[PDB]
Design a protein around this ligand. Structure first.
Ligand SMILES: Nc1ncnc2c1ncn2[C@@H]1O[C@H](COP(=O)(O)OP(=O)(O)O)[C@@H](O)[C@H]1O
Ligand SMILES: Nc1ncnc2c1ncn2[C@@H]1O[C@H](COP(=O)(O)OP(=O)(O)O)[C@@H](O)[C@H]1O
Lengths: 712, 321
């Protein structure tokens, strides 16, 4: 009773914890009340309690600084004891930790302690360690004396003292700058999967020691370099307390025969002695390359040695081995057999949201100017991984440093804290760094949730509902797992597939004609399996195969070669679809502009069983299309969009967009010419109307109508 | 939460408010039928926008006969009129008001139908003196719904050091198999929820489950002198009512001060912001501090500010346990 399980914080502040409101009501404490937390080794910490909409009813959310003061870790239990008697302090003596005050000097109070405590009313207890960030440094302090005891609230009238040599860290105290879970940005889902597999046997070893059931023996982390494969492995070890042993290919391969295998098996022996422990083997493809790809005896032996050491994990209780690779197929398949590394996680490439969070992590200690917009940066840094965003922030810092240091002229071993305090990184420094940074993951496919929403699609009210029913039905109540779109081009086929992914917060995988043609021309149709494998790893996702007839057209379309409607690539797609279940949370969508030449197999039961016709928009839809296209621009009141819609009777949605974009182009030119008008006027639309034409003829519409009536 | 009924003086709970006020209004008909029906129209009907339209349409019928008191065409108000049916007939207490101010409910032949229609017809006794209806019109239009007044229940408490004295059992930190299975099941369910492909409507059905618990709040204020000041507010109450509450509790109600919220945001007395908008609901502690201008003069003069609250409240201070 009155005890909760320790969970991760949402509010990063070091003086506050968050409870679920029902427990604050049972404990009869209010938001902002000061409470004590009772941890292990008869230690306690004092903090303020708030609440949010995400904390579990039976958990307490506290950050790393609070957990370390209590000597507790995620998954442990602490007691909550309100202490309304806490009084305001009169004098508190705070000294920094020596491990973080190196290379920095000057008045630390004015830079760190003063703004940290000033009007903050943070509870403080003697012996507390807390972290104050700023000046591109993370400096933590320990409280050595309090006039009231054993805790108090700092007030504006409280004397803050700081005199004496920095404190040497105690052997039982961990540094607050170590890697933890709060240093991982995107790929939260993948981290959650690792937690499920790894934290249990390490935090609760008795569950597997008392019985014959073994935990997972190893996890293979794969994806582009710089995405957090090693960051996750280190964060998990540091948060759970398991001993972390670092191994990598080059370290073992650089050794001579005998020494190499000895070092590999020695690390495994040390992990058992220091169990619980995690062994992280980086560059798995380098230490254990495919046998058929090497001729040396050393490489063949080291693979056999690793295979035997992994099997020995049945006796090495509480030792888990993790490894990193670029791709699951870059390593000797023996490691991926039942046991060993039979479980793998796809880290992928951070999306726009993840990239923003990664930037915010690297700026924890950075002073930003008011003009800095990290969301705008995250949107522009397409193809970048966390390793590149780390370099991006560092380069922006270095540019800001050079600009000021040229005028500061401070040549010494240390920098006065006030000098760093006044240094800020502005948008011109991130803009410069962006021009110098080059993404390391530009060739790999980037899969994320699309930004196209239902408000961007004019008309098609019934198709929108149909797609929502197809995705919602298997969740609210063999259901179909895919739909083919057919009809005139430029009416929203792609937008519909993206919009349903958007609303579901599902990943969107876009396969275009050139990709299907590349596989066909290069006789590499086997790569289709990799596409479907990504769809599984990306789940929930929408797997969109555009231009399904691109190959049929490449083979003649209207004339034709020696084959039929089927080809090498569609045959692989048809085969792979048969292996995907409705419970994989993957919705497959196709599109074609020439159904008369599509392999009919794709519409056979179990595949793209749904078939939706997307006609040219009617009058009310064309008005909606024009309004949607212009939602991002100023439009004058004299622009009659309904009049335009009445004239553009044969226009597709894409053709109405050309009119809007032409009017935008004309408005821009006029504004530029006047400067060397601020809104799009009717004259700009009337001029655009003189050039825009319908792209789909009446004969092409009849072709689609006849097909629709042929299938019914 | 406790309230006082303005028509009886009784102490009520949040659920007992309508039952006591409605009864007092229905009994009031024995003293002043017009005043009782006016309270009934505004108090019984929850939809105040319709009440405002109803009483405005009634006021027009009364002014119509006032303009042409000698013409029989303005003496009868048809209960089946489109405007009467929508604005007046839909409200409870409007028929009682008409009877109270001299209108009789009768059936008259229609100008184009055999079936008699319902009319409110003004009697000669009241028609002879239009001043009576003119006063009754103003009494209805100037009225408000009757609601029980929220009792602030102003209290001051003295925290006791004994409240935080607790020692844990030796086996406190020894977690059970049932606690481990629940946590591992929540981990497996969290990964599964992240994997599910579902629409926004299905997401809302789950998220929306946390939105309806509270409509009142209890606020506490931590004072420099070690006293805790507490009181009760509506969740929609404005921050200006909290500053007024504290000013009344202070020994010197005129001495400028600030109230700092639990999230680090200072509360502005002159800002029309609700407690459920600034994050002080269902409950919160505020930090009290005097304005710096007066603190400089108080300290410079050698005066220790050792009393924050008025002796009138401190004489009733309760200890916390
Ligand atoms: N997903 C991520 N979130 C946060 N930081 C990341 C992420 N991925 C990479 N980084 C950053 O990039 C660097 C990763 O370098 P390293 O430790 O060699 O790991 P790896 O090469 O396995 O990605 C670190 O500075 C880390 O903070
Ligand atoms: N229904 C629609 N509503 C709004 N805009 C549309 C619509 N259909 C097409 N467009 C416009 O046409 C452009 C191309 O749409 P897209 O879906 O890519 O066509 P397709 O699927 O034929 O390649 C979009 O940028 C959009 O502005």
């Amino acid at each position: 009773p009155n005890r909760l399980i320790v969970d991760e914080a949402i509010n990063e502040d070091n003086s506050v914890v968050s409870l679920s409101q029902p427990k604050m009501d049972e404990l009869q404490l209010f938001r902002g009340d000061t409470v004590l937390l009772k941890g292990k080794k008869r230690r306690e910490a004092v903090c303020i309690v708030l609440s949010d909409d995400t904390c579990s009813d039976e958990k307490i959310r506290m950050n790393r600084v609070v957990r370390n003061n209590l000597r507790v870790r995620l998954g442990d239990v602490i007691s909550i004891q309100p202490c309304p008697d806490v009084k305001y302090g009169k004098r508190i003596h705070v000294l920094p930790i020596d491990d973080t005050v190196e290379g920095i000097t000057g008045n630390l109070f004015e830079v760190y302690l003063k703004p940290y405590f000033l009007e903050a009313y943070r509870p403080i207890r003697k012996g507390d360690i807390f972290l104050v960030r700023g000046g591109m440094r993370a400096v933590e302090f320990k409280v050595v004396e309090t006039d009231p005891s054993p805790y108090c609230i700092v007030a504006p009238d409280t004397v803050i003292h700081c005199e004496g040599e920095p404190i040497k860290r105690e052997d039982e105290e961990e540094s607050l700058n170590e890697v933890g879970y709060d240093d991982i940005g995107g790929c939260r889902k993948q981290l959650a999967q690792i937690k499920e597999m790894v934290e249990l046997p390490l935090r609760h070893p008795a569950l597997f020691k008392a019985i014959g059931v073994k935990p997972p023996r190893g996890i293979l982390l794969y994806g582009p370099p710089g995405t957090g494969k090693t960051l996750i492995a280190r964060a998990v070890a540091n948060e759970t307390g398991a001993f972390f042993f670092l191994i990598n290919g080059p370290e073992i391969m650089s050794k001579l025969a005998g020494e190499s295998e000895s070092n590999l098996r020695k690390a495994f022996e040390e992990a058992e002695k220091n169990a619980p422990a995690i062994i992280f083997i980086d560059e798995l493809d380098a230490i254990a390359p495919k046998r058929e790809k090497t001729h040396g005896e050393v490489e063949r032996r080291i693979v056999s040695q690793l295979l035997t050491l992994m099997d020995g994990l049945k006796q090495r209780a509480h030792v888990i081995v993790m490894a990193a690779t670029n791709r699951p197929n870059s390593i000797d398949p023996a490691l991926r057999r039942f046991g060993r590394f039979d479980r793998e996680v796809d880290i992928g490439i951070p999306d726009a949201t993840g990239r923003l969070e990664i930037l915010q992590i690297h700026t924890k200690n950075m002073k930003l100017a008011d003009d800095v917009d990290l969301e705008q940066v995250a949107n522009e840094t397409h193809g970048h991984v966390g390793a590149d965003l780390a370099a991006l922030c560092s380069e922006a810092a270095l540019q800001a440093i050079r600009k000021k240091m040229d005028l500061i002229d401070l040549e010494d071993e240390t920098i006065d804290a006030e000098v760093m305090n006044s240094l800020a990184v502005t948008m011109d420094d991130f803009r410069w760094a962006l021009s110098q940074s080059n993404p390391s993951a530009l060739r790999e496919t980037v899969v994320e949730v699309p930004q196209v929403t239902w408000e961007d699609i004019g008309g098609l009210e019934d198709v929108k509902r149909e797609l929502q029913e197809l995705v919602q039905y298997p969740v609210e109540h063999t259901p179909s797992k895919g739909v083919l779109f057919y009809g005139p081009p430029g009416c929203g086929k792609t937008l519909l597939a993206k919009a349903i992914a958007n609303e579901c917060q599902a990943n969107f995988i876009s396969i275009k004609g050139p990709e299907l043609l590349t596989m066909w021309f290069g006789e590499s149709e086997a790569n289709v399996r990799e596409i479907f494998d990504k769809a599984r790893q990306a789940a929930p996702c929408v797997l969109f195969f555009d231009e399904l007839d691109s190959i049929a057209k490449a083979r003649g379309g209207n004339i034709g070669d020696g084959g039929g409607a089927a080809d090498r690539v569609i045959n692989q797609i048809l085969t792979e679809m048969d292996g995907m279940s409705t419970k994989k949370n993957v919705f497959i969508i196709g599109a074609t502009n020439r159904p008369d030449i599509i392999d009919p197999a794709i519409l056979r039961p179990g595949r793209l069983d749904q078939l939706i016709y997307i006609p040219l928009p009617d009058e009310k839809s064309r008005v909606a299309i024009l309004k949607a296209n212009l939602r991002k621009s100023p439009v004058a009141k004299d622009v009659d969009l309904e009049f335009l819609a009445k004239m553009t009777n044969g226009f597709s949605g894409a053709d109405l967009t050309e009119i809007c974009q032409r009017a935008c182009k004309l408005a821009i030119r006029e504004s530029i010419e006047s400067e060397i008008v601020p809104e799009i006027r009717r004259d700009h639309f009337e001029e655009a109307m003189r050039f825009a034409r319908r792209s789909v003829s009446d004969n092409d519409i009849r072709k689609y109508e006849m097909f629709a009536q042929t299938l019914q | 939460v406790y309230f006082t009924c303005p028509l009886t003086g009784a102490t009520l709970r949040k659920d007992q408010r309508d039952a006591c006020i409605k009864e007092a209004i229905l009994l009031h008909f024995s003293t002043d039928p017009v005043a009782a029906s006016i309270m009934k129209i505004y108090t019984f009907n929850k939809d105040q926008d319709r009440v405002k339209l109803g009483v405005d349409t009634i006021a027009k019928y009364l002014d119509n006969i006032h303009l042409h008191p000698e013409e029989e065409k303005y003496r009868k108000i048809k209960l089946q009129n489109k405007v009467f049916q929508e604005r007046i007939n839909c409200l409870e207490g409007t028929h009682e008001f008409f009877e109270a101010i001299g209108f009789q409910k009768v059936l008259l032949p229609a100008q184009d139908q055999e079936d008699p229609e319902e009319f409110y017809v003004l009697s000669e006794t009241t028609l002879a003196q239009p001043q009576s209806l003119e006063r009754h019109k103003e009494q209805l239009l100037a009225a408000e719904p009757v609601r029980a007044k929220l009792d602030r229940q102003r209290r001051v408490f003295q925290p006791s050091p004994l409240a935080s004295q607790f020692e844990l059992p030796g086996d406190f930190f020894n977690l059970t198999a049932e606690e481990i299975k629940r946590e591992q099941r929540l981990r497996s369910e969290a990964v599964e929820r992240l994997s599910v492909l579902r629409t926004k409507a299905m997401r809302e059905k789950e998220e929306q489950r946390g939105l309806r618990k509270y409509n009142y709040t209890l606020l506490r204020v931590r004072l420099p002198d070690g006293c805790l000041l507490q009181g009760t507010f509506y969740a929609r109450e404005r921050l200006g009512a909290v500053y007024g509450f504290v000013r009344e509790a202070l020994q010197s109600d005129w001495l400028p001060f600030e109230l700092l919220a639990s999230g680090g945001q200072k509360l502005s007395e002159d800002e029309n912001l609700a407690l459920n908008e600034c994050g002080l609901v269902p409950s919160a502690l505020l930090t009290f501090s005097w304005d710096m201008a007066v603190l400089e003069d108080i300290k410079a003069a050698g005066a220790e500010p050792d009393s924050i609250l008025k002796p009138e409240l401190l004489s009733a201070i309760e200890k916390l346990l």
